[PDB]
Design a protein around this motif. Structure first.
Motif, mmCIF file in Angstrom:
data_model
loop_
_atom_site.group_PDB
_atom_site.id
_atom_site.type_symbol
_atom_site.label_atom_id
_atom_site.label_comp_id
_atom_site.label_asym_id
_atom_site.label_seq_id
_atom_site.Cartn_x
_atom_site.Cartn_y
_atom_site.Cartn_z
ATOM 1 N N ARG A 29 0.831 -1.195 0.000
ATOM 2 C CA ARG A 29 0.000 0.000 0.000
ATOM 3 C C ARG A 29 0.867 1.247 0.000
ATOM 4 O O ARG A 29 2.030 1.220 0.412
ATOM 5 C CB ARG A 29 -0.919 0.070 1.229
ATOM 6 C CG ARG A 29 -1.902 -1.058 1.376
ATOM 7 C CD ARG A 29 -2.669 -0.870 2.666
ATOM 8 N NE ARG A 29 -1.834 -1.110 3.848
ATOM 9 C CZ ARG A 29 -2.074 -0.597 5.054
ATOM 10 N NH1 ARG A 29 -3.113 0.219 5.247
ATOM 11 N NH2 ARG A 29 -1.271 -0.888 6.070
ATOM 12 N N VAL A 30 0.274 2.352 -0.442
ATOM 13 C CA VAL A 30 0.855 3.676 -0.241
ATOM 14 C C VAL A 30 -0.095 4.461 0.658
ATOM 15 O O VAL A 30 -1.262 4.688 0.302
ATOM 16 C CB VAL A 30 1.116 4.413 -1.566
ATOM 17 C CG1 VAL A 30 1.801 5.763 -1.311
ATOM 18 C CG2 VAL A 30 1.968 3.568 -2.502
ATOM 19 N N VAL A 31 0.398 4.860 1.826
ATOM 20 C CA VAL A 31 -0.427 5.507 2.838
ATOM 21 C C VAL A 31 0.252 6.807 3.229
ATOM 22 O O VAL A 31 1.476 6.855 3.400
ATOM 23 C CB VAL A 31 -0.638 4.606 4.078
ATOM 24 C CG1 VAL A 31 -1.429 5.365 5.177
ATOM 25 C CG2 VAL A 31 -1.341 3.305 3.694
ATOM 26 N N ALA A 32 -0.540 7.863 3.366
ATOM 27 C CA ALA A 32 -0.050 9.125 3.885
ATOM 28 C C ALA A 32 -0.779 9.490 5.172
ATOM 29 O O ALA A 32 -1.885 9.025 5.439
ATOM 30 C CB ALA A 32 -0.219 10.248 2.859
ATOM 31 N N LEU A 33 -0.128 10.328 5.971
ATOM 32 C CA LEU A 33 -0.733 10.975 7.126
ATOM 33 C C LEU A 33 -0.501 12.465 6.940
ATOM 34 O O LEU A 33 0.645 12.897 6.800
ATOM 35 C CB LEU A 33 -0.111 10.485 8.439
ATOM 36 C CG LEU A 33 -0.604 10.995 9.822
ATOM 37 C CD1 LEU A 33 0.056 12.325 10.216
ATOM 38 C CD2 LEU A 33 -2.144 11.111 9.897
ATOM 39 N N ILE B 176 -9.887 8.986 2.474
ATOM 40 C CA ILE B 176 -9.324 9.538 3.700
ATOM 41 C C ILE B 176 -10.063 8.998 4.919
ATOM 42 O O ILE B 176 -11.270 8.729 4.891
ATOM 43 C CB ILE B 176 -9.310 11.088 3.698
ATOM 44 C CG1 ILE B 176 -10.602 11.661 4.246
ATOM 45 C CG2 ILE B 176 -9.045 11.648 2.288
ATOM 46 C CD1 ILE B 176 -10.481 13.144 4.578
ATOM 47 N N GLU B 177 -9.294 8.797 5.990
ATOM 48 C CA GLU B 177 -9.787 8.477 7.327
ATOM 49 C C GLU B 177 -9.490 9.685 8.208
ATOM 50 O O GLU B 177 -8.321 10.001 8.467
ATOM 51 C CB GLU B 177 -9.109 7.227 7.896
ATOM 52 C CG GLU B 177 -9.584 6.826 9.296
ATOM 53 C CD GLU B 177 -8.803 5.654 9.890
ATOM 54 O OE1 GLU B 177 -8.886 5.432 11.114
ATOM 55 O OE2 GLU B 177 -8.081 4.955 9.145
ATOM 56 N N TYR C 284 -5.528 10.256 7.646
ATOM 57 C CA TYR C 284 -4.807 9.277 6.855
ATOM 58 C C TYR C 284 -5.404 9.197 5.463
ATOM 59 O O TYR C 284 -6.614 9.369 5.271
ATOM 60 C CB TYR C 284 -4.851 7.910 7.528
ATOM 61 C CG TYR C 284 -4.091 7.872 8.825
ATOM 62 C CD1 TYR C 284 -2.729 7.618 8.841
ATOM 63 C CD2 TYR C 284 -4.739 8.061 10.034
ATOM 64 C CE1 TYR C 284 -2.019 7.571 10.036
ATOM 65 C CE2 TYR C 284 -4.044 8.008 11.239
ATOM 66 C CZ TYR C 284 -2.685 7.763 11.237
ATOM 67 O OH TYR C 284 -1.985 7.702 12.434
ATOM 68 N N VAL C 285 -4.532 8.945 4.493
ATOM 69 C CA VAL C 285 -4.856 8.953 3.074
ATOM 70 C C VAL C 285 -4.402 7.621 2.508
ATOM 71 O O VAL C 285 -3.239 7.246 2.683
ATOM 72 C CB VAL C 285 -4.134 10.103 2.338
ATOM 73 C CG1 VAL C 285 -4.672 10.259 0.933
ATOM 74 C CG2 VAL C 285 -4.236 11.412 3.132
ATOM 75 N N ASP C 286 -5.295 6.917 1.823
ATOM 76 C CA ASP C 286 -4.924 5.697 1.116
ATOM 77 C C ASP C 286 -4.743 6.046 -0.358
ATOM 78 O O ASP C 286 -5.721 6.280 -1.071
ATOM 79 C CB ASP C 286 -5.963 4.593 1.301
ATOM 80 C CG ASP C 286 -5.420 3.211 0.907
ATOM 81 O OD1 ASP C 286 -4.565 3.133 -0.022
ATOM 82 O OD2 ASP C 286 -5.848 2.206 1.529
#
Length: 427
Positions: free
Chosen positions: A7-11, A109-110, A118-120
């Motif tokens: 996965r690529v995940v951002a915060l 987004i969560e 958080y961004v998926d």
DNA sequence: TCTCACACT
DNA sequence: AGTGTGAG
């Protein structure tokens, strides 16, 4: 053996968000040492957000403003709005929705808190990689990105280091392989740059971001280069990064569990966890925690970015510390009514904006002398968005905690009231 | 000297 | 359901 690279995940974290909201509204505050306080009367107010100019003087959150003024005599202060005798966070909640709506144009987004999401990016990265045919990624697409761990190997100022690290990263990138995790992270960083530029253009707000393969590393990455910067933590960077990383810096380890990891195992850094077998960690910390720690110290975590842009609960609370603890029955009812009125306003707003109704009302109090956040939690049905009924019902389900023989007074005195609407249904 | 999410039982 | 934990 799977590497936690799927996965690529951002915060994304809005830099001192409450301060930025007040600075947008009042240009006199921009680029100054400033802080946001609530309740000016007691020791100048409690500081809840601090600009980076003020942090340079040592001002922090949870400081009294009178004490922050000793460190920083020119500190400028903005006050949280007060309504019905309590702090009202509506302006920041509304600003938060502004930002989240922009972010959600780019990816799933969560909402993690009022100022973090958080961004998926996994799917957005895939589609962007197809549109790329096979072109190199220019450093010009990553003007605020740091590559953790770089530069290394055989410049005296910060922006020069950043670019040399970026150059080393991009000069090694394998752009023909559309399934390389490092390439996918890089494209993820390109998209986060565009998202951060869109947030700043459309709201004026700046933010930092971390990009990696999971939420824990993204959150860690985000704090590495702040403010207004983003950091990419690759899977390969983890062994060196974790080799000196205090256990308490990893999300969910900053409390009692993290302290017991340190004391039971006799270690200080996240990377030292690799010496233990999964069974060993599960025996000390339980099946779930042990499995999590075994994977996490290798940089692997599978907690999903949940598609959740709205809070799950809507709550209102106020502490009554020291001499202000509520000691009479009419005092308790009056404050329940104040809390119920703010709750009703926000619940009606919620129903009209997001097409849902709350169905359960949670009441929680703390009695003077108790040790913990909450002394007692009770729930009841939430059938009508009506403040007087909600306050009546809240009182009913707690009126028996009153140890006093007298009808007129409340003992022991109440130091905290909390109303929370939960269990939302489609409406 | 205010919130919000989640796991255990 | 009620409690404890972790975080912003």
């Amino acid at each position: 053996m799977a590497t936690g690279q799927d996965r690529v995940v951002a915060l994304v974290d809005m830099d001192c968000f409450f301060v930025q909201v007040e600075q947008r509204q009042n240009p006199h505050l921009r680029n100054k040492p400033c802080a946001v306080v609530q309740y000016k009367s007691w020791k100048g107010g409690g500081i809840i957000a601090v600009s980076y100019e003020a942090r340079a003087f040592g001002v922090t959150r949870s400081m009294w403003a009178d004490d922050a003024k000793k460190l920083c005599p020119d500190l400028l202060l903005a006050q949280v709005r007060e309504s019905r005798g309590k702090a009202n966070l509506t302006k920041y909640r509304e600003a938060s929705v502004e930002v989240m709506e922009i972010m959600s144009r780019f990816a799933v987004i969560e909402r993690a808190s009022i100022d973090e999401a958080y961004v998926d990016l996994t799917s957005a990265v895939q589609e962007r990689l197809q549109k790329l045919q096979g072109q190199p990624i220019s450093a010009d697409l990553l003007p605020s990105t740091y590559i953790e761990g770089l530069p290394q190997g055989p410049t005296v100022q910060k922006e020069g280091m950043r670019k040399q690290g970026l150059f080393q990263w991009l000069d090694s990138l394998q752009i023909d392989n559309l399934t390389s995790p490092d390439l996918q992270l890089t494209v993820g960083a390109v998209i986060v740059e565009e998202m951060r530029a869109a947030i700043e253009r459309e709201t004026g707000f700046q933010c930092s971001a971390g990009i990696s393969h999971n939420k824990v590393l993204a959150k860690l990455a985000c704090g590495l280069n702040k403010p207004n910067r983003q950091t990419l933590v690759s899977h390969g960077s983890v062994p060196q990064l974790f080799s000196q990383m205090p256990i308490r810096k990893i999300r969910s380890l900053g409390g009692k569990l993290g302290a017991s990891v340190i004391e039971i195992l006799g270690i200080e850094y996240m990377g030292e966890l690799t010496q233990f077998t999964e069974s060993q960690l599960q025996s000390h910390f339980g099946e779930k925690n042990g499995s999590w720690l075994y994977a996490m110290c290798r940089g692997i975590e599978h907690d999903p970015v949940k598609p959740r842009q709205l809070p799950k609960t809507i709550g209102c609370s106020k502490n009554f510390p020291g001499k202000t603890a509520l000691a009479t029955r009419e005092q308790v009812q009056w404050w329940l009514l104040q809390l119920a009125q703010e709750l009703e306003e926000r619940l009606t707003k919620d129903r009209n904006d997001n097409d849902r109704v709350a169905t359960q009302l949670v009441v929680s109090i703390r009695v003077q002398g108790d040790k913990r956040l909450s002394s007692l939690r009770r729930c009841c049905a939430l059938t009508r968005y009506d403040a007087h009924k909600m306050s009546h019902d809240a009182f009913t389900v707690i009126k028996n905690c009153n140890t006093s023989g007298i009808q007129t007074e409340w003992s022991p005195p109440l130091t905290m009231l909390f109303l929370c609407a939960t269990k939302f249904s489609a409406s």
